[PDB]
Design a protein around this ligand. Structure first.
Ligand code: CL
Ligand code: CL
Lengths: 184, 183
């Protein structure tokens, strides 16, 4: 049936057991199946953790980083990550429900032109593989983003590809603790 | 006018100056323009270097990792990265000419069924955002790769998207020092 084993602490390769233990604690007692999946390839698990940590340090706000991640997961057609990021945006960030709804639905953010442009720029980045074009780039800057922010969106898109494509490949089952955030 | 400044050591953000110094030395006295572009966003430059170092110790061989990078740069239409990885493959792997020519055009690899499937798998990942299908996934295992290798290909694709998409957006000028390798 499954292409991949979703690893537990018990079955994961020794050198990632300590990381899965950390993940489980940090998540209040469960391992999101994305991590259990990436445990199959410790360099892929390592990349996902490490880039996550670099990305937090980037030129975007934590809300803007979630704008990038949710929009990418929706554009990439990845249910697991739409659910995972929704849960993070609610519990970690307490994102306004209207912002969250818009991002999940890939529809306009009416309250905040800045974030709405960022969302739309992320879609264009993904579909064009970065060749967004003169007009899309100029609209990105007009609302106050910079060339640095542009490359930090690419960074988020790059991170989104690792987890969205991996979950797309595995058809990763959605943990019971994420099931309520599933799109829909 | 260009959308991005290509940074020098002098113009870069303070916290990446040392990275640029190290890059310049490693390349014998020049900075590849991707690096001067990424310098605009220190975290994107740092991700590119960090993930490169992780990818180069993954479950694929050095040849297989370049199969993935070049195939991805061709598929993503990124001219800079094709030249950058052709350079690395010639210098640092001594890749056979038939292999290198086939990667650079995404034409089949006739001498090597295993690398031909890897190359095809990579294209499928990129064109299907990972939904490569049961049959493409089975051909991948039957050739000798593992589920682990498959996620390490996704890893390579993700790293390629960072540099390919950035270079695509900037239309990064190709350094004179890389020109011999273009096309
Ligand atoms: Cl467990
Ligand atoms: Cl310089």
């Amino acid at each position: 049936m499954s292409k991949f084993t979703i690893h537990t602490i018990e079955t994961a390769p020794e050198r990632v057991k300590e990381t899965l233990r950390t993940v489980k604690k940090d998540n209040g007692g469960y391992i999101p199946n994305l991590i259990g999946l990436l445990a199959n390839a410790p360099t892929a698990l390592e990349t996902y953790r490490t880039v996550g940590e670099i990305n937090r340090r980037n030129s975007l706000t934590p809300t803007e980083r979630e704008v990038v991640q949710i929009t990418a997961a929706v554009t990439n057609g990845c249910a697991f990550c739409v659910a995972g990021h929704t849960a993070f945006s609610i519990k970690q960030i307490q994102m306004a429900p209207d912002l969250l709804e818009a991002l999940r639905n890939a529809t306009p953010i009416d309250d905040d032109p800045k974030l709405d442009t960022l969302a739309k720029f992320t879609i264009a980045v993904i579909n064009t593989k970065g060749r967004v074009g003169d007009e899309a780039f100029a609209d990105f800057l007009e609302v106050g983003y910079t060339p640095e922010n542009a490359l930090d969106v690419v960074l988020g898109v790059s991170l989104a590809s690792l987890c969205n494509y991996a979950n797309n490949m595995a058809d990763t089952p959605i943990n019971p603790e994420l099931q309520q955030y599933v799109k829909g």
